[PDB]
Design a binder for this molecule. Structure first.
Ligand SMILES: [Cl-]
Lengths: 167, 146
């Protein structure tokens, strides 16, 4: 068996955990797994069944610096799971580039669709429309040909903005 | 039916009147306290484990303090109380409550084996209560991120 992803994380001090934290973690049973919880289930109260598949979800974007899914093999999750990325700030880009407008061109659920299991329990979350998920693309304006494209990469906009000329 | 997927998420657990459900070491073991002193609620988060179960449709939810994810809330029918139990003794299948969604993102937890009996609040502690014998808000809790 394998210790669960969140159990591993909450065994270490808060300063040693990745930030941000996974929003949810879903475990897929092998075809031979009879029950969801039990001595032969996905979870037996101590650890998680061998061959189970794990898929973390981050509301900040698709995971970075590792794999999006892993399998329980020999007490370890292989390959190494990715961690949650940081979001980027629309207002920060508008300010650093002196842009007149910044509009998102993709939604976070395109690259990072929420699992169905996230609707099972209402967990209250802070909403901040100024933040966009990792991997979301935007377009900024200068107010001819003054249109620049940007991508959110783990809290940083790519590429660096060419600040608009003084009107 | 196929085997239902199992999901886990951290959350902060609070009551209807916005009191923290916290965990404190008492004589060596963790107890559950309903606190309204304003202390930081980060260390007192819970680890939720939940899955769908076909009902003749039901969301089953299990709850552990992040301070010790090897123990979880459990309904004691021999004392009519809410306690923490460790997985080397108590079976995990008996450790899931039936989630009921209420208004304004509040939820309630019904005992799987004691229909109509819910997790409630009595004297700054969690207890088992009868839905009809209580007001709505007595069994209403809120799960919040961070
Ligand atoms: Cl233990």
């Amino acid at each position: 068996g394998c210790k669960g992803i969140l159990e591993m994380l909450f065994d270490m001090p808060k300063e040693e955990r990745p930030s941000p934290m996974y929003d949810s973690v879903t475990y897929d049973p092998t075809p031979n797994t009879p029950t969801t919880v039990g001595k032969d289930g996905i979870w037996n109260g101590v650890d998680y069944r061998q061959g189970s598949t794990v898929k973390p979800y981050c509301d900040t974007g698709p995971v970075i610096q590792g794999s999006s899914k892993a399998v329980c093999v020999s007490g370890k999750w292989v390959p190494t799971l990715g961690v949650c990325p940081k979001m980027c700030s629309i207002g920060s880009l508008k300010e650093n580039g002196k842009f007149v407008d910044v509009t998102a061109t993709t939604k976070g659920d395109e690259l990072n669709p929420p699992p169905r299991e996230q609707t099972l329990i209402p967990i209250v979350r802070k909403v901040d429309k100024d933040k966009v998920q990792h991997g979301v693309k935007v377009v900024a304006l200068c107010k001819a040909e003054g249109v620049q494209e940007f991508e959110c990469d783990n809290g940083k906009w790519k590429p660096e903005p060419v600040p608009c000329p003084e009107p | 039916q196929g085997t239902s997927l199992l999901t886990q998420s951290p959350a902060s657990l609070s009551t209807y009147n916005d009191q923290s459900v916290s965990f404190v070491l008492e004589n060596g073991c963790y107890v559950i306290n309903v606190d309204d002193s304003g202390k930081d609620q980060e260390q007192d988060q819970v680890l939720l484990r939940y899955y769908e179960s076909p009902c003749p449709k039901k969301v089953m939810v299990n709850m552990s303090p992040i301070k010790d994810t090897d123990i979880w809330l459990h309904a004691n029918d021999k004392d009519y109380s809410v306690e923490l139990q460790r997985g080397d003794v108590s079976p995990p299948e008996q450790a899931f409550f039936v989630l009921h969604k209420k208004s304004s993102d509040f939820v309630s937890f019904e005992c799987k084996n004691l229909p109509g009996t819910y997790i409630g609040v009595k004297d700054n502690q969690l207890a088992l209560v009868e839905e009809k014998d209580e007001s709505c808000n007595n069994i209403m809790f809120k799960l919040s991120k961070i």
